[PDB]
Design a protein around this motif. Structure first.
Motif, PDB file in Angstrom:
ATOM      1  N   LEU A 298       0.819  -1.202   0.000  1.00 44.83           N
ATOM      2  CA  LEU A 298       0.000   0.000   0.000  1.00 44.83           C
ATOM      3  C   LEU A 298       0.851   1.249   0.000  1.00 44.83           C
ATOM      4  CD1 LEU A 298      -2.795  -1.110   2.379  1.00 44.83           C
ATOM      5  CD2 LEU A 298      -2.602  -1.419  -0.107  1.00 44.83           C
TER       6      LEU A 298
ATOM      7  N   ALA B 148       1.911   1.339  -3.895  1.00 44.01           N
ATOM      8  CA  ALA B 148       0.845   1.735  -4.796  1.00 44.01           C
ATOM      9  C   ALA B 148       0.099   2.975  -4.332  1.00 44.01           C
ATOM     10  CB  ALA B 148      -0.135   0.583  -4.984  1.00 44.01           C
ATOM     11  N   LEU B 149       0.432   3.525  -3.171  1.00 43.85           N
ATOM     12  CA  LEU B 149      -0.077   4.824  -2.796  1.00 43.85           C
ATOM     13  C   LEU B 149       0.918   5.933  -3.031  1.00 43.85           C
ATOM     14  CD1 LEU B 149      -2.204   4.739   0.435  1.00 43.85           C
ATOM     15  CD2 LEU B 149      -2.823   5.512  -1.853  1.00 43.85           C
TER      16      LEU B 149
ATOM     17  N   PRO C  89       1.909   5.240  -7.616  1.00 50.15           N
ATOM     18  CA  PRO C  89       0.946   4.439  -8.374  1.00 50.15           C
ATOM     19  C   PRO C  89       1.160   4.572  -9.879  1.00 50.15           C
ATOM     20  CG  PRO C  89      -0.063   6.442  -7.504  1.00 50.15           C
ATOM     21  CD  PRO C  89       1.422   6.613  -7.453  1.00 50.15           C
TER      22      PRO C  89
ATOM     23  N   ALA D 191      -4.713   9.794 -13.108  1.00 46.83           N
ATOM     24  CA  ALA D 191      -5.400   8.572 -12.696  1.00 46.83           C
ATOM     25  C   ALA D 191      -5.222   8.045 -11.270  1.00 46.83           C
ATOM     26  CB  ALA D 191      -5.019   7.445 -13.665  1.00 46.83           C
ATOM     27  N   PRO D 192      -5.196   8.869 -10.210  1.00 47.41           N
ATOM     28  CA  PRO D 192      -5.880   8.433  -8.997  1.00 47.41           C
ATOM     29  C   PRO D 192      -7.199   9.139  -8.814  1.00 47.41           C
ATOM     30  CG  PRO D 192      -3.678   9.250  -8.554  1.00 47.41           C
ATOM     31  CD  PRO D 192      -4.158   9.831  -9.818  1.00 47.41           C
TER      32      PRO D 192
ATOM     33  N   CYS E 146      -5.002   8.103  -4.402  1.00 48.43           N
ATOM     34  CA  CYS E 146      -3.602   8.416  -4.157  1.00 48.43           C
ATOM     35  C   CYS E 146      -3.372   9.908  -4.178  1.00 48.43           C
ATOM     36  CB  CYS E 146      -2.703   7.737  -5.179  1.00 48.43           C
ATOM     37  SG  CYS E 146      -3.373   6.199  -5.828  1.00 48.43           S
TER      38      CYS E 146
END
Ligand SMILES: Nc1ncnc2c1ncn2[C@@H]1O[C@H](COP(=O)(O)OP(=O)(O)OP(=O)(O)O)[C@@H](O)[C@H]1O
Ligand SMILES: Nc1ncnc2c1ncn2[C@@H]1O[C@H](COP(=O)(O)OP(=O)(O)OP(=O)(O)O)[C@@H](O)[C@H]1O
Lengths: 302, 406, 592, 102, 373
Positions: free
Chosen positions: C496, C499-500, C503, C514-515, C518
């Motif tokens: 996490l 990918a946080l 990302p 594209a969060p 995030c």
């Protein structure tokens, strides 16, 4: 909540193609799961986005032949009593015992040792929640799932999600851990929990329980006991202030009138006690159902 | 002889079984209040439901059985069907229903269907009785009876006492004072108010008379000369001032008229072997065997390691005051005292000192509120320890210097 | 909401499924059964002391109650197996009255006595062929009047998780009347016998008779099961050193258990049998010779085209390369002897590896390896004579030349004199070659020169790196380290974080596009002390206002607030911010 | 009529001095809560002042359960034994009138 | 069974007098307290065995539930048939009237002896005041004989009850402990010589324990060890001065080794847990009284000081969290927020410092100036 959710999914999630592709990477991973689960392993898979739709597509493509108890854990109805009850009637095709949880646990263990190839496997969305975990709770799932004839699949979500497993609790289900990411928003959790901007589930009563004195906890034990003991009397219109004052004073929970009045008005803030003025002008007290009031102080004393 | 066994048999029952002795004192007006009420509720179909409150150990059961026996002497056996209930046995509603079924000889007709509304249940009991009729309900120990889940056998009795008009006396026997304030408001507002007794004691120079009338051999004659000799010995003991001294000392601790029974009962246990007429000193030691200091017998018997431990706890009040301590500060204070001492007899090592703690917990002089070095609480007085240390017979000089240092 | 649907085997998926799966089932079932046999053999020295102790403490009964507190290891994973073996041994040589209690089925006393008398009732009613307390004594009085009254024993599995109250009341109840019912309890202490003083106060602790036993400390348990399980010639599937290194590290650092290690070996075997189509012939040598001779030709092109074999192609001449490239009939002939050479390399490898282990374990300070496990590690990570550690052994072994070295040459020679004809045919007849060196041990220079020729012939001849020395070695060796490690021991707290924070999956997002979430977390920890709600909502509003204009303001505030609250429910939900109750609002930075 | 004043009026000597110790500690603290050792010390002082013998706390706790049974005061359990927090069930001017009238 | 008294005659005599003969009534309830050593079931059993007052003996340690307590009383009483079942108390009072109507016991004062009543204290609130008034509840000439470890003053129901007659069984005297600690049965010596041994041993030993059972155990241990150099070497003073050097160590010695092998990260975990339990007044900043005990502290502080202790190749895997859960089941660490949540509560340390010192020293770490100084 509702008018907030009308604006949900209006226009433009800011990527779609790589989201479909990243979910489309994981569809090749399914026959491995079927074989791996046939050998007695247990799959947890964690993620950052919503993967229960992947589980639903999985059981659509490969569980048309077997039994599956799709246990949601996000909405606040489910504890493991419902798991055992539903697996008793709707799987074993007859009802079981009713005396205790361990009795039906041992009994539903006992039904599978003699009946070969019955081939039942549930799967659990959101094994870690506010409701689903517990050392009484999780071990029943474990002891249930330790057998040869039961194959759970879970999804954990939390940061401290593998903190509720010691090694002996870990050795009941042979875990192996998959990695997933979907980025889909968890619409069922966020739908059916709450929204802060607007009955009450167990979380906010847990929060008021953990932010207050234990004597106020013993006060609402008394008030919820007097409510639950007279739930099906339609003439029960609630205690007065003086009756509750003398029945709280007899158990040494509070000393003064003003302290109990300040406790009553700070608990009237959280909307868990409603005042009702009778024809005397005296305001009686009754809180907003019955079956959700047995769960706390069932579990507050186990 | 005949006399000693017969006096022991005849005095022992009215002393310690609280048998029905016919003398009753201090209660004549409340009894006379009860009697005509009982006669008009019993002789006629009307139902009034009196209530009695007094302290424990005095009055109630003796009065209601004495009035009951005197009413049962009057016929037209009048077919009053008394029913004795207690608050202690019948804790719940289902027990109470079958208990009334037991008392009223109902099981000739089987009645083997649980009805939902228990007013219909109680009315069926009264109904099958009434076709078969007065009853008298003696509802003993009412304060435990006020803790039903739904207060059925309180309230339905009041509703039937006003509504069925079968002859009924709901006579409650209580011990706590607030029977009305403890009673829930639909019942207390409904029919709790029939006229409420109160019960209390009286003056000491008549209490010496009730000592004499209690102790004296009765108008029953074992042998009349021995009756005269012994009750004259009762009066001669009664007029002596040391008996009056210990009796006044018993008055100010006890206005009870039950403690007198025990106090005199020990005296009567001592008399029959020799000197069948007894001394004031025999009454004095009979009072002395009724102990005064329950904890000095505990502390006086303890060995000296627990003694210097418990004065170390006393010393833990007299520096760094008012915490529930643990083992470690106790250990430190004990080691600082033994390093103040020169001799190496009493430098007993650490696992031995744990044994005195876990023996001391079973006497409950220390209180738990982690498992072995936490938060223990002392419940004691300085002064009983200070009296006990000088009464320790093999008390060494170093714990005496610990006591004087303190 | 647990809705159930009613419905109203050999599926594996080239590497064709049926004999592949049968090969799997045979090898794993063989390994599991021999694993249990080699478990039960090692504890015989332990519990055959215990049968003596319990027999002595029962037979002197004509005030006391005997306890034998085992000191089992920290591994609660394998405590079931030792208790099953101990139950078997105590059931055989002593009484058929053995029950065991688990400390999870008895929180308080009624459950304790009810499950104890139920287990005792079935245990007595089987081999002769109810909440009450003294009826158990009556059961003992009825059921065994003879056979000198065999003593009932209970087995508390965990001493530690028991509450003290129910255990104390049981010990006082049992110690009250053991006139009839002689009871000898054996609680399994997980830690050490210190805690039997801790959990039992001194009156109950004084009531009984304590005699403790050791148990097998787990390092010299896993040397046996590693040494017999993979280091032998017998089992057809070996393992890569790096995959083994991963497995033994997560033994020795975290888990300290052996059942987890067997789970890791089982997973490795399973993933190997999934992985590559040449894995089907992982057998003994005539079972390899069975269907090497008949096989699909694209898998024979795969046996040509795997890279170790193409290294062998690279080292060889053209006139057999032109027929051995494509034609199956010669390809079988060369690969058969390649598989024989694989078995040959294993067979002369492992016995002299054990010989070197005995010859290196005798040394002071043992600088190469502490035990037999790590000798496999040091001869495969680096090249062994390239590495400084065997250089340190060779520097050590010169002036160690005294009668300790000659005596342990005789002793190590005696233990592989037991392994002289236990290998029973060597691939170079190295047993009688080395024994022909080792037969002059009875009759101070000779140890030095014989040492020189022995380690040089030994280590330079066979003791080498198995991939590059041996083509077709893929069939026996499974190697995928950090593919496996994340299956066996994962880290979502790193996932996490990754990918946080980053990302970036495959268009431009590596250091705003594209969060939603995030954006929320990264902007949450761009103000990295603590936060309140509305200013954080304005900051998120500012950065997606920037996202909007790099592609009315009130509708945009509405949709930004809606996607904000959808983000912030998840950012509560996933183990970050805990809600700050009774204030106006704030969020609390719970994870740094 | 109210039961409580008649109960105090027909209470014994050590009970009346116990109530005097209760109100003396309530005059010292001002509060409605008091532990048993504090009023025990006050009771020791009053039995010293009256020429009474020494109030041993077996007798004093027997008299505590006497007055706690009759609900002139409200009592913690006797297991706590020195740590009993007692509250007064009657108002203070009532018991002042009850011990003041003679 | 043999000696009824061994010189505690006055309490025995007043109790024996208090029973009286059979055909008249006695006390409702008698409560006997005392220390646990003080013969409180020896005296009453040897007293009741002499006259054969037809009695039932129970322990309240055995009967953990109420039903078993009534069942064994009624079942043992009717012998003086089937299990005469009683679910409730009123069933016991009901069946008691039929049971106590036999000519063995029609007029005889039946004794219901109740041993270790402090376990009956937390059985119910019903059963103890229901048992104290049994003489007029069922009215069948009964006397419920209490004996207890604990004082009556905690034992009262805080409503009042029928106050029983209370005896104090006295402690044993010093010269009485010379006499009654086995001056009878010395097998092979003079009773003077075994008395001389135990007279020497006792006055040394009369400060730790006056319990006759364990002192009988210790005397029967250390007397044949004393007795062997007399019968082998051969004068009481010399072997007195020899037996007290053995006696000091036998005193002290009535726990194999504290060291436990652990997996290496678990060693470092509880090292970090100790180090964040015992000086933690925000002294995280400096390196990177004691007597009151361990202070609780949350999990992320433990993870931070773990990262400071360990070589930095650690990752928060699943196994390091599962290991840190599994340490608490072995009770080396304790969660003190009992239900504060699944997220990381305060975990306070609960192992001793020497054990911690050995675990620190077996992986290359000296920490005592690092721990609190
Ligand atoms: N005025 C009186 N005349 C005769 N005896 C009395 C009198 N007052 C008290 N007693 C004696 O005091 C005791 C009172 O017992 P009773 O059960 O009647 O009242 P009680 O004990 O207060 O009631 P409870 O049993 O509910 O506490 C009996 O021994 C009785 O003989
Ligand atoms: N006067 C005595 N003479 C001989 N032996 C005694 C004497 N007093 C006690 N004992 C010993 O004590 C044992 C009985 O112990 P005791 O009667 O002290 O138990 P208890 O007081 O009921 O114990 P607890 O108070 O812990 O329930 C007897 O077996 C006997 O060995």
């Amino acid at each position: 909540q509702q008018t907030l959710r009308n604006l949900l999914s209006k226009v433009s999630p800011s990527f779609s193609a790589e989201l479909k592709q990243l979910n489309q990477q994981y569809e090749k991973l399914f026959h491995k799961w079927m074989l791996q689960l046939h050998l007695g392993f247990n799959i947890v898979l964690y993620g950052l986005g919503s993967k229960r739709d992947l589980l639903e597509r999985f059981r659509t493509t490969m569980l048309q032949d077997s039994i599956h108890v799709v246990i949601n854990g996000f909405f606040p109805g489910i504890s493991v009593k419902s798991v055992l009850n539903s697996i008793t009637e709707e799987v074993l095709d007859h009802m079981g015992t009713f005396r205790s949880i361990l009795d039906q646990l041992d009994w539903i263990v006992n039904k599978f040792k003699e009946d070969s190839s019955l081939e039942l496997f549930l799967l659990i969305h959101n094994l870690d929640s506010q409701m689903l975990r517990g050392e009484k709770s999780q071990q029943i799932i474990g002891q249930l799932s330790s057998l040869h004839n039961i194959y759970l699949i879970a999804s954990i979500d939390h940061l401290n999600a593998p903190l509720m497993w010691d090694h002996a609790k870990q050795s009941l289900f042979n875990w192996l851990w998959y990695e997933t990411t979907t980025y889909s928003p968890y619409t069922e959790e966020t739908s059916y929990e709450n929204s802060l901007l607007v009955s009450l589930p167990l979380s906010s009563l847990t929060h008021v329980l953990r932010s207050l004195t234990p004597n106020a906890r013993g006060i609402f034990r008394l008030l919820i006991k007097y409510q639950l003991d007279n739930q099906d009397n339609p003439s029960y219109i609630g205690l007065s202030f003086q009756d509750f004052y003398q029945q709280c004073r007899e158990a040494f929970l509070v000393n003064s009138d003003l302290t109990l009045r300040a406790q009553l008005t700070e608990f009237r803030d959280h909307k868990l006690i409603r005042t009702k003025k009778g024809t005397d002008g005296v305001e009686y007290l009754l809180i907003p159902d019955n079956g959700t009031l047995t769960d706390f102080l069932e579990k507050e004393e186990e | 002889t005949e006399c000693l066994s017969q006096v022991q048999r005849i005095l022992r029952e009215r002393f310690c079984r609280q048998s029905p002795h016919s003398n009753l004192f201090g209660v004549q007006v409340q009894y006379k209040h009860l009697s005509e009420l009982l006669k008009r509720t019993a002789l006629h179909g009307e139902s009034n439901s009196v209530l009695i409150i007094g302290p424990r150990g005095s009055g109630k059961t003796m009065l209601i059985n004495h009035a009951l026996k005197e009413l049962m002497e009057i016929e037209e056996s009048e077919n009053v069907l008394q029913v004795h209930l207690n608050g202690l046995l019948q804790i719940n509603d289902k027990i109470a229903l079958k208990e009334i079924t037991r008392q009223l000889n109902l099981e000739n007709v089987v009645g083997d269907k649980v009805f939902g509304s228990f007013a219909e249940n109680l009315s069926f009991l009264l109904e099958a009785l009434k076709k078969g009729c007065p009853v008298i309900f003696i509802l003993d120990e009412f304060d435990l009876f006020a803790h039903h889940k739904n207060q059925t056998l309180l309230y339905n009795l009041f509703d039937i006492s006003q509504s069925a008009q079968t002859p009924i006396a709901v006579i409650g026997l209580t011990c706590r004072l607030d029977i009305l304030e403890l009673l829930e408001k639909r019942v207390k507002s409904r029919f709790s108010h029939r006229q409420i007794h109160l019960m209390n004691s009286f003056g000491f120079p008549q209490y010496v008379k009730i000592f004499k009338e209690q102790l004296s051999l009765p108008a029953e004659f074992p042998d009349k000369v021995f009756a005269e000799k012994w009750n004259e010995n009762v009066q001669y003991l009664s007029e002596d001032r040391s008996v009056q001294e210990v009796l006044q000392k018993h008055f100010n601790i006890s206005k009870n008229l039950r403690s007198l029974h025990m106090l005199l009962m020990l005296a009567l246990n001592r008399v029959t072997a020799s000197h069948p007429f007894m001394t004031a000193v025999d009454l004095m030691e009979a009072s002395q065997l009724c102990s005064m200091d329950s904890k000095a017998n505990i502390v006086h018997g303890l060995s000296v390691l627990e003694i210097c431990l418990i004065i170390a706890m006393k010393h833990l009040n007299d520096i760094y005051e008012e915490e529930p301590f643990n083992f470690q500060m106790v250990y430190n204070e004990f080691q600082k005292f033994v390093q103040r001492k020169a001799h190496s007899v009493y430098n007993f090592e650490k696992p031995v000192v744990m044994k005195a703690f876990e023996h001391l917990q079973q006497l409950e002089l220390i209180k738990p509120m982690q498992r072995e070095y936490q938060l223990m609480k002392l419940l004691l007085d300085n002064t009983q320890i200070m009296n006990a240390l000088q009464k320790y017979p093999n008390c060494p000089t170093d714990v005496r210097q610990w006591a004087t240092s303190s | 909401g647990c809705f159930v649907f009613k419905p109203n085997e050999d599926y594996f998926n080239p590497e064709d499924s049926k004999l592949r799966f049968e090969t799997y089932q045979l090898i794993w079932q063989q390994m599991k059964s021999e694993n249990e046999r080699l478990q039960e053999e090692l504890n015989k020295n332990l519990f055959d002391n215990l049968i003596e102790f319990l027999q002595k403490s029962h037979s002197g009964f004509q005030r006391e109650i005997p306890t034998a507190a085992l000191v089992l290891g920290v591994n609660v994973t394998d405590h079931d197996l030792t208790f099953g073996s101990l139950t078997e041994a105590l059931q055989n040589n002593v009484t058929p009255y053995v029950v065991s209690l688990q400390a999870k089925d008895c929180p308080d006393m009624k459950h304790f006595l009810q499950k104890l008398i139920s287990q005792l009732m079935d245990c007595c009613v089987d081999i002769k062929s109810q909440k009450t307390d003294p009826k158990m004594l009556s059961k003992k009085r009825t059921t065994s009047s003879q056979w000198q009254s065999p003593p009932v024993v209970v087995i508390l599995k965990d001493m530690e998780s028991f509450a003290t109250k129910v255990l104390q009341d049981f010990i006082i109840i049992s110690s009250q009347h053991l006139h009839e019912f002689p009871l000898i309890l054996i609680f399994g202490i997980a830690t050490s016998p210190i805690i039997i003083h801790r959990l039992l106060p001194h009156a109950v602790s004084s009531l009984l008779c304590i005699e403790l036993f050791q148990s097998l400390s787990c390092k010299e348990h896993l040397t046996t099961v590693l040494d017999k399980l993979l280091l032998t010639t017998q089992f057809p599937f070996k393992i890569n050193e790096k995959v083994l290194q991963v497995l033994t590290n997560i033994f020795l650092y975290h888990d300290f258990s052996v059942q987890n290690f067997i789970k890791g070996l089982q997973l490795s075997l399973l993933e190997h049998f999934y992985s590559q189509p040449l894995s089907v012939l992982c057998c003994n040598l005539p079972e390899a010779k069975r269907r090497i001779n008949f096989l699909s030709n694209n898998q024979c092109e795969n046996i040509r085209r795997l890279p170790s074999f193409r290294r062998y192609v690279e080292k060889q001449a053209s006139e057999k390369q032109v027929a051995l490239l494509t034609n199956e009939r010669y390809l079988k002939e060369e690969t058969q002897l390649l598989l024989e050479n694989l078995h040959v390399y294993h067979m002369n490898y492992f016995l002299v590896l054990r010989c070197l282990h005995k010859f290196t374990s005798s040394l002071p300070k043992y600088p190469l390896g502490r035990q037999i496990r790590e000798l496999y590690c040091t001869c495969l990570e680096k090249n062994i004579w390239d590495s400084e550690e065997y250089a340190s052994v060779l520097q050590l072994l010169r002036m160690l030349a005294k009668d300790e070295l000659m005596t342990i040459l005789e002793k190590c020679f005696k233990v592989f004199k037991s392994y002289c004809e236990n290998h029973l045919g060597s691939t170079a007849k190295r047993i009688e070659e080395f024994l022909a060196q080792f037969q002059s041990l009875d009759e101070k220079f000779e140890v030095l020169r014989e040492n020189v020729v022995n380690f040089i012939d030994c280590l330079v001849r066979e003791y080498l790196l198995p991939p590059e020395t041996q083509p077709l070695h893929e069939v026996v060796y499974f190697s995928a380290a950090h593919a496996l490690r994340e299956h066996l021991n994962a880290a979502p707290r790193i996932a996490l974080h990754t990918a946080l924070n980053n990302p970036y999956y495959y268009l431009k997002n590596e250091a705003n596009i594209a969060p939603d979430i995030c954006i929320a977390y990264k902007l949450h920890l761009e103000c990295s002390r603590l936060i309140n709600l509305v200013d954080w909502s304005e900051a998120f509003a500012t950065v997606v206002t920037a996202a909007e204009k790099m592609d009315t303001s009130e509708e945009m505030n509405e949709i930004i607030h809606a996607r904000f609250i959808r983000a912030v429910s998840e950012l509560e939900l996933l183990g970050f911010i805990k809600p700050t109750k009774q204030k106006t609002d704030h969020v609390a930075r719970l994870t740094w | 009529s109210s039961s409580y004043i008649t109960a105090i009026k027909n209470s014994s000597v050590l009970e009346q001095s116990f109530l005097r110790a209760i109100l003396a500690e309530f005059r010292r603290s001002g509060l409605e809560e008091a532990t048993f050792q504090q009023i025990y010390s006050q009771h020791v002082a009053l039995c010293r002042m009256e020429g009474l013998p020494y109030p041993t706390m077996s007798e004093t706790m027997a008299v505590c359960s006497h007055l706690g049974s009759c609900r002139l005061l409200l009592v913690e359990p006797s297991r706590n034994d020195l740590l009993l927090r007692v509250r007064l069930n009657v108002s203070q001017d009532d018991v002042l009138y009850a011990l003041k009238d003679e | 069974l043999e000696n009824v008294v061994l010189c505690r005659e006055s309490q025995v005599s007043i109790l024996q007098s208090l029973f009286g003969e059979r055909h008249h009534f006695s006390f409702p309830s008698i409560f006997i307290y005392g220390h646990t050593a003080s013969g409180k079931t020896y005296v009453t059993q040897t007293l009741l065995k002499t006259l054969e007052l037809p009695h039932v003996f129970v322990n309240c340690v055995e009967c953990f539930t109420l039903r078993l307590l009534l069942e064994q009383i009624l079942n043992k009483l009717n012998h003086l048939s089937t299990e005469i079942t009683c679910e409730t108390f009123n069933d016991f009072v009901r069946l008691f009237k039929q049971v106590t109507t036999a000519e063995n016991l029609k007029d005889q004062t039946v004794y219901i002896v109740l041993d270790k009543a402090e376990y009956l204290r937390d059985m119910e609130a019903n059963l103890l005041p229901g048992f104290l008034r049994l003489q007029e509840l069922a009215d069948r000439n009964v006397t419920v004989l209490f004996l207890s470890e604990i004082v009556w003053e905690k034992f009262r129901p805080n409503t009042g009850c029928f106050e029983p007659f209370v005896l104090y069984f006295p402690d044993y005297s010093i010269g009485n402990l010379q006499k009654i600690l086995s001056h009878d049965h010395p097998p092979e010596y003079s009773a003077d010589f075994y008395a001389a041994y135990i007279n020497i041993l006792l006055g040394v030993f009369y400060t730790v324990c006056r319990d006759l059972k364990e002192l009988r155990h210790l005397a029967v241990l250390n007397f044949p060890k004393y007795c062997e150099p007399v019968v082998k070497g051969e004068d009481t003073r010399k072997l007195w001065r020899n037996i007290e050097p053995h006696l000091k160590k036998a005193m002290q010695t009535v726990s194999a080794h504290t060291h436990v092998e652990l997996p290496y990260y678990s060693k470092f975990i509880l090292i970090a847990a100790y180090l964040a339990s015992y000086n933690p007044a925000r002294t995280d900043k400096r390196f990177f009284n004691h007597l009151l005990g361990p202070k609780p502290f949350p999990l992320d502080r433990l993870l931070a000081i773990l990262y400071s202790i360990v070589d930095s190749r650690v990752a928060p895997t699943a196994n390091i969290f599962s290991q840190i859960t599994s340490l608490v089941t072995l009770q080396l660490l304790t969660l003190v927020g009992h239900d504060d949540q699944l997220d990381g509560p305060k975990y306070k340390c609960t192992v001793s410092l020497d054990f911690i010192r050995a675990i620190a020293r077996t992986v290359n770490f000296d920490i005592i100036k690092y721990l609190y100084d």
